[PDB]
Structures are given as C-alpha cells and as structure tokens.
Symmetry: none
Subunit: 120 residues, 2 copies
C-alpha cells in the first residue's frame, strides 16, 4: 500500500527536520533548485567607532526665511516648493547623520542669516 495519501501522513509523522532533509534531498536528486540564493543584506560593526553623525534640525527660520530657504535647498537640493513647505512645517530636520564639519557649516550659515538651529 504505497499510496500517495499514505506518504502525506508520513510527512506528518516525522519531525520538521526530517522534512527539511527530505525536500533538500529531492531538490538535489531531481535537481529542482535555484542553487544561487539572492537577497543582499547585512551590517558589520566593531569597537573603535567614529563620531561623525550629527543631526541638524531647523527650529525657526527667523526673520530671514529667504536666506534659510537657500541654505535648505542648498544643503539638500529639494524643489523650491518642497523647501518652502519644509521650513513652513517647522520644526523640520535639515540633515541626519552628517559630518560635524558640515553640520556646523550650515549652522553658522543659519546664524549669519539670523535663524534658530538645533544640533543633536
């Protein structure tokens, strides 16, 4: 009685592992596998980390929305509109995880114009 049904209850008789091995077996035997795999995804790490991830937030454009808008699109490159809305939607994050030098560069720019910036 080597029916197909009996084979069904057979797989439901063994452990998942046994099922993995089986499937894996046939896969090779009948050669019905896309032996290749693809996904790409990972993220290594190790002591001795750097500190060049500063976030520049914009609190108040101040009485110089003009210069600000410039600094914005200038630091990013978003459409005039997008930039406008951004500022108009204050507070708004200008940059995230950028080099300190860059952060302070724009920061000083905001100050020169007379705007309120946030560094975190």
């Amino acid at each position: 009685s080597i029916t197909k049904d009996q084979i069904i209850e057979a797989v439901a008789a063994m452990s998942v592992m046994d099922v993995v091995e089986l499937i894996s077996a046939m896969e090779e035997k009948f050669g019905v596998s896309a032996a290749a795999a693809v996904a790409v995804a990972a993220g290594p790490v190790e002591a001795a980390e750097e500190k060049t991830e500063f976030d520049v937030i914009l609190k108040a454009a101040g009485a110089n929305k003009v210069a600000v808008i410039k600094a914005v699109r200038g630091a990013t490159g978003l459409g005039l509109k997008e930039a406008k809305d951004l500022v108009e939607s204050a507070p708004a994050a200008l940059k995230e995880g950028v080099s300190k030098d860059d952060a302070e560069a724009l920061k000083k720019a905001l100050e020169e114009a007379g705007a309120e910036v946030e560094v975190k």
Copy 2:
C-alpha cells in the same frame, strides 16, 4: 521501511502529474501556502507621478554633422553607418524616455557643436 531516501525513489516511481498531487496534498494539508504577502512587484500606479521621461529629437545636425554623428553613436552606440543614415534621415529621435539630466547633457553637446535639437 520509511526512510527519507526510500521516499526519494518513490517520487521517481510515479508520474509527474501523480507527483504534483502528492506535493499538492501536503501544501493544503499542512497549509504551507498562506503567510501574508510581504511584497513581490511593488509598483502601484497612483497620483504623484515623476517627471524623468524626456525625449531628445534631432531636427538639424547643422554645420557640424561630424560632432553630431559623434554625439549620436556616443549616446547610443549604433554603427557609424546607422548613425549616418539616422542623421541623414532627419528629423530623427535620438532618445526616448530618458532622464532630464541625460537629455540636457546631449542637448548642450549639440549646442556646443551648433546643431538644432528638440526637447519634448
């Protein structure tokens, strides 16, 4: 005598169709065919469309068919001849649905040579 291997030779004992039923049985039984749908294609069609599909047409090569021919084959890679005929068959579409940056890149190139281009 229900070994993993014995099962392998079992699948190679029946027809493909009969096997399809086998595999199918388990699929339904263990219901191992219904675990949400993370994604597959991911590309719906809704408002908020982009504008990066510009067409660069060539109207007149001008008094610089040489430079033009270069720009042509350079932007495409068609045989010297093909390119020649193309230009000689003006007007001729250079590119279709290409990035604006690219469109303007060749455009400026044509201008540098002194040719008439069309952007649509």
